[PDB]
Amino acid sequence: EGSEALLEICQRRHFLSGSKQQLSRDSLLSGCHPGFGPLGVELRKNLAAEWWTSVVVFREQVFPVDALHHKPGPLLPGDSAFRLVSAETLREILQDKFLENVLKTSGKLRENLLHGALEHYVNCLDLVNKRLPYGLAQIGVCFHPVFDTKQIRNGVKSIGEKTEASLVWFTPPRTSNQWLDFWLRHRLQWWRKFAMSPSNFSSSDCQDEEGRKGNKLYYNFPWGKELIETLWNLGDHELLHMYPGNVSKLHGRDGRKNVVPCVLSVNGDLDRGMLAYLYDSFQTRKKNLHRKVLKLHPCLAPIKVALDVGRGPTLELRQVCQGLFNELLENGISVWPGYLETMQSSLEQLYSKYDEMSILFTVLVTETTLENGLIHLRSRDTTMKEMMHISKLKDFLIKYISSAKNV
Template identity: 55%
Template sequence: MKFGIMIMRQWKVSNKLFQNHWKILGLWLGLRKCSKSTCDLSGFTETLLELCRSRHFVSGDEITQDMLVDGSFNYGHLGMELKRNLATNWWDSMVLSREQVFGMQSPHQLKVNQNSDKSMKLMDVATLQVALDKKDANKEGSVSLKDLLKEYIILRPNLLQGAFREYTTSLNLVNRKLPFGLAEIGVCYQPIPSSKYSTVCNAVRTVEVELASLVWFSSPWTSGRWLDYWVRQRLLWWRKFARSPSSFTAIDSQDNDGIKGTALYFTFPWGKEPIETLINLGDKDLLREHHGNKSSLQGRDGRRTVVPHVLSVSGNLDRGVMAFLCDSLQLTEKVDSKLRINQKKVLKLHPFLAPFKVALDMGKGPTIELRQVCEGLFQELVEKKVTVWPGYLETMHMSLEQLSIKYDEMGVIFTIVVNETTLENGLVQLRNRDTTMKEMGHISEVRDFLIKYIRES
């Protein structure tokens, strides 16, 4: 009985402290990990926007959700490296590792054809204004705007026509054997509503997007199987770099002209958006481009000679960049001793996509000697094609905790800290972004480990 009274007294004395401990534990359990599925979506988007600006993935103060979706923003230093890595991996996968795909490059301006009404046209505004003024002055309209509008430049909305024009030359390259493909990465100009989220919107604007395109030529009787093949391959490729592969999905689609195909979507915090389209265009567009000259277009599939069907595989690299930024952003909320909630942001980009694989920084010690060590290690890693962020050039000193926060938000995989211990025995500190583990190792072993890790990722 006395033991029970003693426990009750102890409970009354420490009840407030006990409740505070449970409050902290509850907050820790409830807020320890905040993913896109549990966080407020608008809050996640705002956090993503702020991180993209502060860590130089995008440039500019007035960045909106619409601009992220459309790709109508300027890239910062890290964003440009991320996009370049994405394009390089696309090219390696689609061109360099395949026997039947060849690279090409075509001009931004299109040759006038029957589809020109659907393309974006570029005209000199001053010339157009003079014509309009003259027409207003002369009610009979002696100046024909219709004739004037013929003097325009057509900007390509996609990369199809360049591949169509290159087809006959490439057909000779492969000894007229089907199937084969032509790949290209280039800037295109596409019209979109000025506010796609408004209920009533008649205005359109043009956005500049970078597309990665494969145009695949195959016989009519195998085109359906090839379309299924490329859908599987492309979905696997996008999912390969994702922390949440299920965010990338394939959905049957149909464009405004009734052409059926498949679209690959990514689930953004604000909803699903297409990042790649795959459609079977048949042979109509190819024949029209070559004025119906079937004899020059026929290729061989086995013993049969035929005009090929065209499969278009077109991915939006700008939207792909935003997809991987959304996918890789991990938010963790921790409660400190004063019950304050601190949010930690980590950009867990795939090693192939991370703009910088390694950050190189200095700790305590003689500045000149440590900087010389950093410069030497920097050159060794760069020569091995490992991208390095030269943090040792910063003039403002930061604690190791502040460095970890900065580099986690930049998506840097490893951080190397060189200090006075390095000068004594060659040991450096290595921190892993994903595990947050800090280990000591000899500078030569760390260098060899990083080179091997990046190559084998």
């Protein structure tokens, strides 16, 4: 069919995701995949960097925060759904005499990261001089319980890891609605930014069972819409519940009055967003062009420039690339260290390999580069060659990225 199956080819192959012959959309969405390949990690890091730049940076009164991956044992209400079994089957009580059986007062792995932000809000209140409008952002990996709901061979609930970026924003209650609408619009812009087909990203409104109104963002995967980013009006009730001893300490200042801030949580899944970007970048029937390529945005592609050499009469002279490669490493431009395999690989094969690898530009150094230095530059978006010059490379690439950053 080629829908979610052909993509998995040239996905595990070019190490954008772990290679275990899974090819299961359910496994990926669940987060039970063994892991992501180096290119997948690089792409996720690029997406996280873009999110940080567009959230913490170009936005005042935003500060970082870190949340622990594990929670303390004591004072832990609730219990695991699968763990709770006491209906029957208690014939063997031969055991002599925390211990116990109701959760054992033991620890618990975190499912959500905004709890740490809520806990650290009290310490971060003094950062903005108790100014009500301000937020804390954090990117972190959370482990969730997932069960296939089929058979009993799986047995205990599986656990899936997923990286999410959560921002908790404290705003005046009066302007909570308009601030939430503006935040939803900004997130929609950001997701539509770096999007090859922005229409696939969609938004919807939802009503909480308590009565709180929120927004849900979905990506239209080939099989169906999947939630990626969720905005919820926390309602401030749980913050008060965490500190019932005295609320006179937590009241922030807005204008010239003191009020308890309203909390909005915007949580986006970097694990599911990256898959959405992968799917969107990939395009089939009566196309007459072929040439499968992952057209990721230049601003968050994993690899920018790939270096190579060709028809070099004196291969020893290839060190012209060396240093230049190092020069490209300065100012944070990622490069694919080619010119090492040196097998008899056809130019078209190498170009296809780089295209499937989502490389913006391909640089080839030839014998005509030592004097009047011109290097053959090929573009991912258009398979067309250029000559250009060495001294114009670095800045140009930076310009390109900069010009990609803002439309």
